[PDB]
Ligand binder design. Structure first.
Ligand SMILES: CCCCCCCCCCCCCCCCC[C@@H](O)O[C@H](CO[C@H](O)CCCCCCCCCCCCCCC)COP(=O)(O)OCC[N+](C)(C)C
Ligand SMILES: CCCCCCCC/C=C\CCCCCCCC(=O)O[C@H](COC(=O)CCCCCCC/C=C/CCCCCCCC)COP(=O)(O)OCCN
Ligand SMILES: *OP(=O)(O)OCC(C)(C)[C@@H](O)C(=O)NCCC(=O)NCCSC(=O)CCCCCCCCCCC
Lengths: 128, 459, 124, 67, 80, 88, 98, 110, 178
């Protein structure tokens, strides 16, 4: 009929183009029901204290605390040396340093050799 | 120079004998008077230093640092006197005593005329800071922060003491003047290589160098606001002062021993600057920005040119002021909402307009907007680096763009958007907080009016 | 364009090169060449501060036009004859440049024809 | 001046805006016509463009393939 | 103030391209039930509009008349 | 000055005007309590078209979750009034 | 399929409350209880600044060398210099080819 | 260019404010008669932008095109410049046609 | 926005949403009113053709093909209402929305002006305080022991009561707060 749409990581698949919504089984229906139940009970728990006249301050969100803790303090206890982690650490931590060292060393060696051999256009180079 | 040293030692008993409800007033008033007195050190000569006595001296590099320290103490008092309201009078006097001792040790450190006394005071600064962090911090991570801070410092500082006594035995003196006049080249030897490492590594750690910087986020995040201010504004610049004082004896080894550190400072500049883009904690964002700026200063000192030295001095002063202001601004929100997460309280420009303009001015200064002294220092360092190697401009420009990106990102996240709905305890900004912000920011602009006062001895 | 069409599609060696020009001596086909005349001296052009590209063989008319512009200031329409004279001098200079281009083109034409004819004679 | 909404009718206009718009359009067109009358050469050109293929071989200084 | 809406019965699709649309739809056994809701866009002062080239020559008549007058004045100024 | 302070009477008048310009509704049979499905015998697609017509008339869009359950002119005028903070 | 009776009732009650609140948002006639030359702009915004700037340029900036540097005026064949009084010669016998 | 571009934006703002903060040209109907001053200003600006002779845009744009045609330059750059000169008139026509000619397409409350 | 969503959309709901989307994008394509009317009636007929089908499987299959066609033919730049979630004026006035509790932080000299307004505000606060506990009790009565199954709220069922969780709905700032 028409050319298809190929999803990717940065341009995802639309809901109306997803076959998972056009083939519905009762298990999926009850799964949707319990998802809505969880969302509704969370919304009620938030709204009960949001509308409280006697509340003053910040409503504590355990999800936000869990997120910040997982992104800050829970990383090292769950770290394990593996070939993937070892190779990635070595590469991303040492490779850039050696690359930039090689680049700058080569550039400065060329500049110094030119200076000793006697031409770099050093005229008016007072400030250094 | 005892006309500045003695009044702080008199701040001590005046604080300890003031009545319960006037400690803050007396401390603030007399600290401001002491800063006014210390302002007289800015009249520097053009050829040599101001050799007051056999033990103390001042040049145009240590005078702005002394003025910054004396000015920072009253700001620390004003910002501290809010979260210590429920504290007993004795422990409030103890806290003020810690701050006074820190300022006194820093004042003697910046003017000690010989290297062993400078080392003694440079290490003595550790005790009040550690006590402040681990006694008046808020969370349970303050103990680990104090341990990291202390041991990171001492691990790099003990070999410095060994090298200093070795140098004194070999040459006969450690007075800065005799050391400079009688300087001799260092030969390319393994012994000289390790002497260079011992002399440099303590100040590397104090900056901190990228790789040895893991103590700084912990210490600056877990500390109370006064501790954070003194850590970011002054205590980070001890490394720069020591580096630019001790490099006079490390030539010409530096020409090839600076190659690793330079790399660590340049690429690290990018890395830390990228971390700020994904920080969910405001204080950690400010700490990592401090790390990147200090990396730029390390590059400036390592390439060792007059323009680089002027830029390093200007950047040290400018970063001290800016980072102190940013920490105070973040602390205001923290006292509002008792959480450091950036996305918790949003859209604060609607509710706190004047604090919003303080936020904007601080962020503009942080990303080096001309003609601020931040930009002056950064640009002088960049020109010196370009003279050193024309390929450095790529890394410097990358860093500039990322710095603008995360500064405006933090400003937009905290101040713009819509307010969080459930947060209803955001009271109007107090006169104390606005005065603190103004006293942080007015000296910055007044200094860009007359920048030669913060450009160092090479000017 | 037509010259571009011939050069980039036809025999390029048979068409003049705009950068490398002239190829032939200035007296190859002229029994007598008269040197071009300059009316304004160097000092006059220097004092008028015309420009480093407006100091061509037409600079005298430009100097006259600038003087007339400055002298009749409020009436900015009072300099039409001088403007036309400068435009006409520049037009004549452009005509001479076109004449030089055409002369080089047909000189290359004749050179190629003569070379091919001499080669043909050598074939016997 | 006060002008009311009309709900599916042409909006109420003013004589001032109409005369101003007409005056400015007329001014533009008059200026264009007047300038083209006086300075037509700025569009049509002034000096003739010569044809190189018409020039004689003598004024270009070339011998008749003799040497 | 306090404007009141016009009569709704005055909106007739007759005499508009909505007539052509309705006829072409009826040729296929289809109806357009919203044509009267759009008729106001064609009835009143929006009945006729100028073309693109006509819009470009908005004030040509007055400009040309003034041009002719000024040209005649400057031509007969040559009677010195 | 911007648009005048639109009131309840204007909303009701304009909704009824738009509905009276609909060729599937008898003008004298239509009232403000007239249900679309029962009192007028229209189906779901007609209700969607009416919703789009009111959206186009009032210059704002009613989401599908909210629009599908507006079956009376009074319901439409109430929803529009609540959206624009019309209290008079 | 339209509002359920509970939805209709809740919407109606909320609507009545909201309309009451919006009505209460209005201002009584006394609500802002407030507690108890023809050409001056040119003189104060143009004349005074130009006086200050002219003083600062004439007597302070121009006191130092090279602070104010002007482009050299153009000299054409035929003009007379105000100080020297000399006359620049005419520009060499135009061929007058029109 | 400062002149006519600034006044074109001001005309667009006049249109937007008049049509209840609407910016899409697909809902701007016949404003040639509804807004006479706005339409005359926008027409004059669109004609100056396209280089109509003896207007402000003329004295700069026609000279620029003539200098580009008479220079030792890129062929592709020359062709791109000419095509862009055509597309300028194209989108000016787009704006005028879709905003000022035709029949109204905006909400009934005028 | 004001309606509590369900766990899923029925086939009729999906068909109606696709119909509205197709009509909106068609109007975006056909900018002129008469052309839009003609093609909208054609689209209405095309939708009416299969409305009588009884086989649900082929009905949902045809809906899927309809969805694929719409994606291919959708307008790249559909018309969006100015205040819609994609429009040019979507969140233009959110910087002017100030929560009402901010008024509690005003200085007494500020509250000296608008005395009647703050008297009415005190009335409203007292009403909220007296109604809160009844609201909580009523909400506690009506929900199952396993928690609510949907986020729809009940109305007030007594003469003196108020609809539970009403304060923040009623005291919204405004649509144009400044
Ligand atoms: C987390 C970040 C912390 C900070 C990191 C600081 C880095 C410190 C490194 C300092 C660099 C210089 C050290 C050695 C100087 C020369 C470099 C080396 O390649 O020596 C070569 C010699 O070849 C071999 O490399 C000799 C050294 C072999 C052993 C060193 C390898 C150590 C591995 C790196 C460990 C990582 C550092 C951290 C330790 C905890 C040079 O050849 P040559 O011109 O003839 O000798 C010049 C020096 N002379 C004249 C005094 C003799
Ligand atoms: C936060 C962590 C920071 C860690 C920093 C600690 C390491 C700093 C670098 C090493 C410092 C040790 C230097 C020792 C003191 C210097 C004095 C000196 O240079 O004198 C030399 C002596 O030189 C030495 O003996 C140096 C020996 C070093 C032994 C200690 C090993 C420590 C670890 C070495 C590798 C790591 C160094 C760099 C690590 C960087 C941190 C990652 C000359 O003495 P003579 O015997 O008389 O020789 C001349 C006549 N023949
Ligand atoms: O409740 P009601 O209002 O009566 O709804 C009636 C309903 C259709 C729901 C009912 O009769 C029913 O359940 N029918 C089942 C079959 C059915 O409706 N299947 C869907 C038909 S899809 C179709 O063919 C539509 C064609 C057009 C698709 C869009 C393509 C063009 C898009 C490009 C835009 C420019």
């Amino acid at each position: 009929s028409f050319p298809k749409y190929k999803p990717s990581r940065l341009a995802t698949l639309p809901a109306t183009l997803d076959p998972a919504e056009y083939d519905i089984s009762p298990e999926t229906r009850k799964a949707q029901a319990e998802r809505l139940a969880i969302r509704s009970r969370l919304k009620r728990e938030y709204l009960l204290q949001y509308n409280d006249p006697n509340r003053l301050g910040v409503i504590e969100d355990p999800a936000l605390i869990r997120w910040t803790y997982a992104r800050s303090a829970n990383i090292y206890p769950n770290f394990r040396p593996t070939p993937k982690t070892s190779l990635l650490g070595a590469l991303f931590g040492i490779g850039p340093l050696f690359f930039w060292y090689y680049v700058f060393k080569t550039d400065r060696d060329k500049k110094e050799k030119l200076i000793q051999e006697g031409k770099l256009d050093q005229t008016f180079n007072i400030s250094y | 120079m005892l006309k500045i040293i003695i009044p702080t030692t008199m701040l001590l008993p005046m604080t300890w004998m003031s009545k319960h409800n006037m400690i803050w007033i007396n401390a603030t008033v007399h600290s401001l008077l002491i800063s006014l007195i210390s302002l007289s050190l800015l009249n520097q000569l053009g050829e040599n230093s101001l050799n007051f006595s056999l033990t103390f001296f001042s040049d145009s590099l240590s005078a702005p640092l002394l003025v910054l320290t004396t000015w920072l103490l009253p700001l620390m008092l004003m910002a501290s006197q809010s979260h210590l309201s429920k504290e007993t009078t004795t422990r409030k006097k103890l806290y003020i005593t810690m701050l006074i001792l820190l300022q006194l040790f820093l004042i003697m450190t910046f003017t000690a005329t010989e290297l062993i006394l400078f080392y003694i005071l440079f290490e003595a600064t550790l005790v009040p800071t550690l006590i402040i962090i681990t006694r008046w911090g808020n969370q349970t991570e303050r103990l680990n922060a104090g341990l990291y801070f202390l041991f990171y410092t001492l691990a790099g500082s003990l070999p410095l003491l060994v090298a200093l006594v070795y140098i004194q035995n070999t040459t006969g003196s450690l007075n800065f003047l005799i050391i400079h006049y009688w300087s001799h080249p260092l030969s390319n030897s393994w012994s000289n290589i390790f002497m260079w490492l011992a002399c440099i590594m303590a100040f590397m750690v104090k900056m901190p160098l990228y790789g040895l910087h893991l103590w700084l986020p912990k210490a600056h995040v877990e500390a109370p606001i006064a501790g954070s201010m003194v850590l970011a504004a002054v205590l980070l610049k001890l490394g720069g002062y020591g580096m630019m004082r001790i490099t006079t004896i490390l030539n010409p080894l530096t020409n090839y021993m600076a190659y690793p550190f330079l790399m660590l400072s340049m690429w690290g500049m990018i890395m830390t600057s990228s971390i700020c883009l994904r920080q969910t904690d405001l204080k950690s964002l400010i700490a990592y920005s401090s790390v990147s700026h200090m990396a730029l200063v390390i590059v400036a000192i390592m390439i060792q040119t007059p323009w680089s030295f002027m830029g390093a001095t200007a950047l040290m002063i400018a970063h001290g002021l800016t980072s102190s202001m940013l920490f105070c601004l973040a602390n205001t929100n923290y006292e509002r909402v008792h959480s450091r997460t950036m996305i918790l309280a949003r859209g604060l420009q609607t509710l706190l307009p004047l604090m919003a303009t303080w936020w904007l001015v601080a962020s503009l200064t942080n990303l080096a907007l001309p003609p601020s002294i931040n930009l002056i220092g950064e640009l002088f360092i960049i020109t010196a680096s370009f003279s050193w190697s024309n390929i450095t401009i790529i890394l410097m420009g990358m860093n500039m763009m990322i710095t603008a990106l995360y500064s405006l990102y933090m400003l937009i996240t905290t101040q713009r958007g819509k307010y969080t709905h459930h947060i209803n305890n955001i009271k109007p900004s107090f006169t104390r907080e606005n005065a603190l912000m103004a006293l942080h920011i007015l000296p910055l602009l007044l200094l860009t009016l007359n920048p030669k006062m913060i450009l160092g001895p090479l000017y | 364009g037509a010259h571009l069409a011939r050069r980039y599609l036809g025999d390029a060696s048979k068409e003049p090169d705009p950068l490398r020009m002239p190829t032939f001596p200035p007296d190859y086909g002229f029994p007598e060449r008269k040197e071009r005349e300059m009316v304004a001296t160097q000092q006059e052009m220097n004092d008028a501060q015309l420009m480093l590209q407006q100091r061509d063989y037409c600079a005298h008319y430009l100097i006259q036009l600038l003087k007339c512009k400055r002298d009749s200031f409020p009436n900015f329409l009072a300099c039409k004859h001088e403007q036309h004279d400068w435009d006409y001098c520049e037009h004549l200079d452009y005509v001479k440049r076109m004449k030089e281009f055409e002369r080089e083109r047909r000189l290359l034409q004749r050179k190629k024809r003569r070379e091919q004819r001499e080669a043909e004679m050598a074939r016997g | 001046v006060h002008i009311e909404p009309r709900y599916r009718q042409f909006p109420q206009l003013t004589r001032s805006q109409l005369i101003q718009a007409e005056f400015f359009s007329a001014t533009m067109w008059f200026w264009i016509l007047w300038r083209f009358w006086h300075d037509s050469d700025a569009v049509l050109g002034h000096f003739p463009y010569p044809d190189p293929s018409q020039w004689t071989d003598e004024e270009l200084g070339i011998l008749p393939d003799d040497e | 103030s306090k404007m009141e809406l016009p009569d709704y019965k005055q909106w007739k699709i007759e005499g508009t391209p909505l007539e052509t649309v309705q006829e072409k739809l009826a040729a296929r056994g289809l109806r357009d039930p919203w044509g009267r809701n759009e008729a106001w866009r064609y009835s009143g002062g929006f009945a006729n509009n100028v073309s693109f080239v006509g819009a470009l020559l908005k004030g040509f008549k007055w400009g040309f008349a003034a041009f002719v007058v000024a040209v005649g004045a400057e031509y007969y100024l040559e009677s010195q | 000055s911007d648009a005048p302070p639109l009131t309840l009477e204007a909303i009701k008048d304009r909704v009824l005007y738009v509905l009276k310009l609909y060729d599937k509704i008898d003008p004298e049979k239509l009232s403000v309590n007239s249900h679309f499905m029962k009192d007028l015998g229209l189906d779901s697609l007609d209700q969607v078209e009416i919703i789009m017509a009111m959206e186009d008339e009032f210059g704002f869009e009613i989401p599908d979750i909210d629009a599908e359950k507006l079956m009376c002119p009074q319901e439409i005028v109430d929803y529009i009034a609540d959206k624009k903070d019309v209290y008079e | 399929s339209g509002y359920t009776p509970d939805e209709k009732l809740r919407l109606q009650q909320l609507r009545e409350l909201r309309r009451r609140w919006l009505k209460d948002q209005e201002l009584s006639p006394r609500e802002p209880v407030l507690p108890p030359r023809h050409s001056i702009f040119a003189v104060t915004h143009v004349l005074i600044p130009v006086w200050i700037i002219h003083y600062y340029l004439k007597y302070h900036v121009t006191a130092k060398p090279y602070t104010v540097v002007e482009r050299k005026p153009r000299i054409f064949p035929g003009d007379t210099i105000l100080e020297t009084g000399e006359v620049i010669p005419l520009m060499k016998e135009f061929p007058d080819q029109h | 260019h400062a002149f006519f571009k600034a006044m074109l934006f001001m005309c667009s703002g006049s249109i937007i404010h008049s049509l209840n903060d609407e910016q899409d040209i697909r809902k701007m109907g016949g404003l040639y008669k509804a807004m006479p001053f706005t339409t005359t200003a926008l027409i004059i600006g669109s004609l100056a932008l396209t280089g109509m002779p003896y207007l402000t845009g003329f004295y700069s744009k026609d000279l620029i095109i003539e200098a580009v045609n008479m220079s030792y330059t890129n062929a592709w750059a020359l062709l791109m410049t000419l095509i862009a000169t055509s597309l300028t008139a194209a989108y000016s026509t787009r704006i005028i046609f879709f905003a000022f000619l035709g029949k109204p397409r905006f909400p009934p409350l005028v | 926005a004001f309606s509590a969503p369900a766990a899923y959309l029925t086939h009729q709901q999906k068909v109606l949403r696709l119909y509205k989307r197709a009509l909106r994008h068609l109007e975006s394509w056909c900018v002129h009113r008469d052309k839009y009317r003609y093609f909208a009636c054609l689209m209405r007929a095309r939708f009416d053709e299969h409305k009588n089908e009884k086989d649900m499987v082929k009905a949902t299959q045809l809906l899927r093909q309809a969805e694929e066609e719409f994606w291919y033919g959708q307008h790249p730049q559909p018309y969006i209402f100015p205040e819609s979630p994609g429009g040019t004026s979507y969140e233009r006035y959110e910087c002017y929305k100030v929560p009402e509790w901010c008024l509690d932080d005003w200085h007494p000299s500020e509250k000296a002006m608008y005395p009647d307004y703050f008297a009415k505000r005190e009335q409203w606060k007292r009403l909220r305080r007296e109604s809160w506990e009844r609201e909580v009790k009523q909400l506690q009565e009506e929900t199952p022991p396993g928690g609510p199954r949907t986020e729809a709220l009940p109305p007030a069922r007594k003469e003196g009561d108020l609809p539970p969780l009403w304060w923040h709905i009623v005291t919204r700032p405004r649509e144009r707060p400044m």
